[PDB]
Amino acid sequence: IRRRYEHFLTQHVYGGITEQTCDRVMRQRRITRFPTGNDCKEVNTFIQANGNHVRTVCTGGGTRQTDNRDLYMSNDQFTVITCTLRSGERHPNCRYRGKESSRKIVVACEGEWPAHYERGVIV
Ligand SMILES: [Cl-]
Ligand SMILES: [Cl-]
């Protein structure tokens, strides 16, 4: 729960993300394909915002789907950067291309806490 929130922050929340800096952050945060081991995650999206800001999607700043009652779509647009694996199979060799877009974000909320990045939608 608190560990699920912290996992979500690690995987999906980085205010300093750019299209050209996927590789450093994916490596440093050790973001992987599976819950254990060393494998490069194929696709990973960072929301370009702070954690407390992203949390608000679960406490009034989002719309239940629903669809799936655990999923909330943000009312505001967020900038996201999607990092897609270009080469490498294991850290420290994971190389990504990054792509910025502006989207409403859809997060799974476990009560007041974001737990999963479901997707980002446009308009
Ligand atoms: Cl993702
Ligand atoms: Cl490798």
mmCIF file of all heavy atoms in Angstrom, residues 40 88-91 93-94, ligand 2:
data_model
loop_
_atom_site.group_PDB
_atom_site.id
_atom_site.type_symbol
_atom_site.label_atom_id
_atom_site.label_comp_id
_atom_site.label_asym_id
_atom_site.label_seq_id
_atom_site.Cartn_x
_atom_site.Cartn_y
_atom_site.Cartn_z
ATOM 1 N N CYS A 40 15.527 -4.891 -18.855
ATOM 2 C CA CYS A 40 15.032 -3.565 -19.295
ATOM 3 C C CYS A 40 13.514 -3.608 -19.493
ATOM 4 O O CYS A 40 13.020 -4.484 -20.207
ATOM 5 C CB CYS A 40 15.700 -3.195 -20.634
ATOM 6 S SG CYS A 40 17.496 -3.097 -20.647
ATOM 7 N N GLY A 88 19.328 -2.946 -25.797
ATOM 8 C CA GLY A 88 19.711 -3.444 -24.476
ATOM 9 C C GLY A 88 18.713 -4.414 -23.914
ATOM 10 O O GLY A 88 17.520 -4.307 -24.182
ATOM 11 N N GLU A 89 19.206 -5.379 -23.142
ATOM 12 C CA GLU A 89 18.359 -6.399 -22.544
ATOM 13 C C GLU A 89 18.383 -6.299 -21.027
ATOM 14 O O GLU A 89 17.400 -6.622 -20.375
ATOM 15 C CB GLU A 89 18.812 -7.800 -22.936
ATOM 16 C CG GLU A 89 18.657 -8.069 -24.423
ATOM 17 C CD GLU A 89 18.183 -9.457 -24.670
ATOM 18 O OE1 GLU A 89 18.864 -10.429 -24.215
ATOM 19 O OE2 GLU A 89 17.097 -9.564 -25.288
ATOM 20 N N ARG A 90 19.520 -5.884 -20.475
ATOM 21 C CA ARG A 90 19.624 -5.758 -19.018
ATOM 22 C C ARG A 90 20.312 -4.450 -18.628
ATOM 23 O O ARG A 90 21.142 -3.923 -19.389
ATOM 24 C CB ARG A 90 20.368 -6.972 -18.422
ATOM 25 C CG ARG A 90 19.584 -8.294 -18.454
ATOM 26 C CD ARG A 90 20.432 -9.504 -17.995
ATOM 27 N NE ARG A 90 19.695 -10.753 -18.207
ATOM 28 C CZ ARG A 90 19.900 -11.563 -19.244
ATOM 29 N NH1 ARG A 90 20.857 -11.292 -20.127
ATOM 30 N NH2 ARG A 90 19.180 -12.670 -19.381
ATOM 31 N N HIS A 91 19.988 -3.916 -17.444
ATOM 32 C CA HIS A 91 20.755 -2.767 -16.945
ATOM 33 C C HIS A 91 22.211 -3.221 -16.810
ATOM 34 O O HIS A 91 22.465 -4.375 -16.479
ATOM 35 C CB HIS A 91 20.200 -2.283 -15.596
ATOM 36 C CG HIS A 91 18.816 -1.723 -15.693
ATOM 37 N ND1 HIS A 91 18.558 -0.485 -16.232
ATOM 38 C CD2 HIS A 91 17.616 -2.239 -15.343
ATOM 39 C CE1 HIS A 91 17.255 -0.256 -16.203
ATOM 40 N NE2 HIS A 91 16.662 -1.313 -15.683
ATOM 41 N N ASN A 93 22.555 -1.479 -19.617
ATOM 42 C CA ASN A 93 22.585 -1.282 -21.070
ATOM 43 C C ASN A 93 21.268 -0.868 -21.708
ATOM 44 O O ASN A 93 21.151 -0.905 -22.942
ATOM 45 C CB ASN A 93 23.123 -2.545 -21.761
ATOM 46 C CG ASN A 93 24.374 -3.059 -21.102
ATOM 47 O OD1 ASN A 93 25.342 -2.292 -20.879
ATOM 48 N ND2 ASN A 93 24.369 -4.335 -20.753
ATOM 49 N N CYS A 94 20.287 -0.474 -20.890
ATOM 50 C CA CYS A 94 18.965 -0.092 -21.413
ATOM 51 C C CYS A 94 19.030 1.294 -22.071
ATOM 52 O O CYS A 94 19.429 2.285 -21.435
ATOM 53 C CB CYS A 94 17.878 -0.135 -20.312
ATOM 54 S SG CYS A 94 17.905 -1.617 -19.327
HETATM 55 CL CL CL B 2 22.155 -6.148 -22.251
#
